[PDB]
């Protein structure tokens, strides 16, 4: 099968499809998914697309944790419209924190999740990626954040023997980096970052030597595992006025695509930190520019 390096390469620079199906109900928080935007994201270059899902309100609470046959139905429809359209794909369990309020106690819920996820997206291609979980980091020891990594991983490879997993492979902030070194030995797995500081604006020249800095330590950590990295939502922060805006995007950009990372800017849908309108369907294409 495809490698995660091949696969990575493949990704480039793609966009989330965000506050839709990882809200507590599709369409609560920005427009739910429609098959146009697809078209839309293919007509604007996007080589990839991340789309969350809580799968919270949609499984049940008590054992055996089913999932609605409609929910799934309604992930895989979308799921095939970004698939047919040549995006590499990627899907995750986002904003299920429920997991973090009692790992002990709801594993099992989450294990179940997953067993249902892998089960019914087995035979899809190469190009659907499974994210075990968003934000593994937070309210959770390592202990546990590696324990869940390595049960979902085994989960996962007993119906997708080969199909890549991306697993959290660390975090930053603007005064340090911290980087996993328990990786399970598996020859499909991305490692992805994700801006998180434990004690919670930009876009100055200060800004961007911290990033490049982070950066550069990320691909060391990357050569030394044989891991290679994404970066599934940046651009998370809100900015200054719009001139650092475009810039922080075209430096992001640049430096990740510079040290061979695949990147999903997160864009919510909002107009906050959008660029593709879902109602007009048009681009902020000056960020697009800056995209690509």
């Known amino acids: 099968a495809v490698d995660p390096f091949e696969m990575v390469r493949k990704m480039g620079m793609g966009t989330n499809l965000g506050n839709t199906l990882e809200?507590?109900?599709?369409?609560?928080?920005s427009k739910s998914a429609m098959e146009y935007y697809f078209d839309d994201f293919k007509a604007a270059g996007y080589?990839?697309?991340?789309?969350?899902?809580?799968?919270?309100?949609?499984?049940?609470?008590?054992?055996?944790?089913?999932?609605?046959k409609a929910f799934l139905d309604r992930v895989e429809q979308v799921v095939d419209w970004s698939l047919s359209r040549g995006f590499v794909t990627i899907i995750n369990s986002h904003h299920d924190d429920w997991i973090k309020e009692d790992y002990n106690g709801n594993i099992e819920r989450f294990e179940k999740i997953w067993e249902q996820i892998a089960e019914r997206?087995?035979?899809?291609?190469?190009?659907?990626?499974?994210?075990?979980?968003?934000?593994?980091?937070?309210?959770?020891?390592?202990?546990?954040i590696d324990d869940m990594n390595s049960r979902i991983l085994k989960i996962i490879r007993k119906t997708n023997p080969t199909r890549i997993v991306i697993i959290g492979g660390g975090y930053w902030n603007?005064?340090?980096?911290?980087?996993?070194?328990?990786?399970?030995?598996d020859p499909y797995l991305i490692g992805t970052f994700h801006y998180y500081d434990p004690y919670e604006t930009w876009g100055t020249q200060e800004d961007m030597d911290t990033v490049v800095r982070v950066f550069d330590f990320v691909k060391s950590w990357s050569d030394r595992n044989n891991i290679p990295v994404y970066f599934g939502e940046f651009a998370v922060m809100a900015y200054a006025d719009?001139?650092?805006?475009?810039?922080?995007?075209?430096?992001?950009?640049?430096?990740?695509?510079?040290?061979?990372?695949?990147?999903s800017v997160w864009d919510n849908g909002v107009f906050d930190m959008a660029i593709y309108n879902r109602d007009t369907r048009t681009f902020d294409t000056e960020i697009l520019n800056a995209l690509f």
């Not at 809200?23 to 928080?29: F, L, M, R, T």
């Not at 991340?50 to 609605?68: A, E, K, S």
């Not at 035979?123 to 546990?144: A, C, R, V, Y």
């Open 23 to 29: 809200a507590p109900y599709e369409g609560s928080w």
């Open 47 to 68: 080589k990839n697309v991340r789309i969350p899902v809580r799968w919270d309100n949609h499984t049940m609470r008590t054992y055996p944790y089913t999932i609605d």
């Open 121 to 144: 997206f087995k035979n899809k291609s190469e190009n659907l990626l499974f994210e075990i979980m968003n934000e593994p980091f937070g309210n959770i020891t390592d202990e546990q």
């Open 174 to 185: 603007s005064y340090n980096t911290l980087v996993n070194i328990k990786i399970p030995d």
């Open 242 to 263: 719009r001139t650092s805006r475009v810039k922080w995007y075209d430096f992001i950009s640049d430096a990740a695509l510079e040290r061979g990372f695949a990147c």
